[PDB]
């Protein structure tokens, strides 16, 4: 509840899940740099890890940093609701998952060929690079 | 009963009904003291009818108003009118008219809307545009 000082404990650059995080960002919004971690998700893992949101990224100790990456990789074990997850009711094993920085584009990709392998209409328009959700195309999306 | 006069003030849609009774000087807005009106930056709009005449005028009378309709700002102007009109109307009926004409002089010389309701109302919208005078942008 007052200004405090520290020396040598701040860490300017963090590395979490093979992603570089700026250490002078507030912890809740620093994790949003990790792809697959939005503002809504980052708010809860810090609250489940008892990391008060009033701390910058470099303020955290190693003990706290490992406690966060553990929760993100195992969300359901920490009373994180299934509906709150990124990839729930998975295609192959049917369980609720939350894919992260490097895993996200791999399983996002696997969904694309899975649409394209069966040659569905939605997968085809994805192949063409067009809008797949029915949006009009006669007058919008003319950039490159 | 007792010496009671009832009046009202109005703005665009807001209407504030003021009851002025004889008493110790109780002045409430919808059952709450005027010292706690929400629009703080406008709290002096309702303080004006008080400090203009002097709080000594309110020793013998208590005022309870009920303001409904309009908006947040439109309600403030409705309240201050009901109070100003209520103080004048009580003097005309239970005090000599010389004093009533004195109070009305200070009020009118400061702000006409303290006693006279503003007649401005919203102009109806006309087709061919999104507003009363505004029109859809034209192309050739």
């Amino acid at each position: 509840p007052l200004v405090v000082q520290e020396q040598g404990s701040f860490q300017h650059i963090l590395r979490l899940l093979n992603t570089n995080i700026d250490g002078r960002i507030k912890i809740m919004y620093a994790l949003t740099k990790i792809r697959g971690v939005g503002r809504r998700y980052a708010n809860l893992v810090c609250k489940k890890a008892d990391v008060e949101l009033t701390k910058r990224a470099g303020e955290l100790t190693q003990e706290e940093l490992e406690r966060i990456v553990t929760i993100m990789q195992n969300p359901t074990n920490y009373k994180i609701p299934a509906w709150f997850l990124n990839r729930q009711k998975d295609q192959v094993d049917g369980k609720d998952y939350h894919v992260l920085a490097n895993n996200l584009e791999s399983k996002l990709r696997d969904d694309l060929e899975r649409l394209k392998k069966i040659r569905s209409h939605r997968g085809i328009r994805h192949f063409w690079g067009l809008k797949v959700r029915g949006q009009h195309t006669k007058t919008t999306s003319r950039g490159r | 009963s007792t010496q009671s006069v009832q009046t009202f003030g109005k703005k665009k849609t807001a209407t504030a009904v003021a009851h002025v009774k004889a008493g110790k000087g109780l002045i409430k807005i919808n059952g709450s003291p005027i010292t706690l009106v929400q629009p703080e930056i406008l709290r002096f709009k309702v303080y004006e009818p008080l400090t203009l005449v002097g709080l000594d005028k309110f020793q013998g009378i208590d005022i309870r108003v009920k303001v409904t309709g309009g908006g947040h700002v439109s309600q403030v102007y409705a309240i201050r009118q009901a109070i100003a009109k209520g103080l004048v109307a009580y003097h005309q009926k239970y005090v000599d008219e010389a004093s009533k004409n004195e109070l009305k002089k200070i009020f009118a010389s400061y702000d006409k809307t303290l006693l006279v309701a503003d007649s401005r109302r919203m102009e109806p919208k006309k087709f061919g545009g999104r507003g009363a005078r505004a029109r859809f942008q034209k192309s050739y």
Binding site: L65, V69, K89, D90, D93, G94, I118, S120, H121 | -
Partner: protein, 129 residues
């Protein structure tokens, strides 16, 4: 972050859909199958199956029974392209109307749970120039 490794493992993996592998998937009744797919499919079967989807399934079943040297089960044609693919009809071949022609599709296992007309585009793609 500690570390990470990705050594993917197998065991003669059979294709699997939401935790149910192909062997058990195909002989599950369609009443049980809909309980493990999306919200739209679950709603559709609760709303009541009219005679049209059920009639196509009966013909599709017979078309497979027509051939027992284990080749393709001959084509059943249909207009009803709001049909939801079920594991029962895997391997059958259906002709799905796109408004003009009978597009022919073979029901692969990964097609299960999808709409039958989603694999027959109704418009020839635009080609400028």
């Amino acid at each position: 972050m500690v570390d990470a490794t990705a050594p993917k493992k197998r065991t003669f993996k059979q294709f699997s859909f939401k935790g149910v592998d192909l062997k058990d998937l195909v002989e599950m009744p369609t009443e049980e199958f809909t309980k493990l797919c999306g919200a739209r499919v679950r709603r559709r079967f609760s709303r009541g199956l009219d005679s049209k989807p059920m009639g196509l399934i009966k013909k599709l079943r017979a078309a497979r029974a027509a051939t027992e040297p284990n080749e393709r089960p001959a084509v059943v044609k249909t207009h009803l392209r709001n049909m939801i693919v079920v594991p029962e009809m895997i391997g059958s071949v259906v002709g799905v109307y796109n408004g003009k022609v009978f597009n022919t599709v073979e029901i692969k296992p990964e097609m299960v749970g999808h709409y039958l007309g989603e694999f027959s585009i109704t418009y020839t793609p635009v080609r400028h120039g």
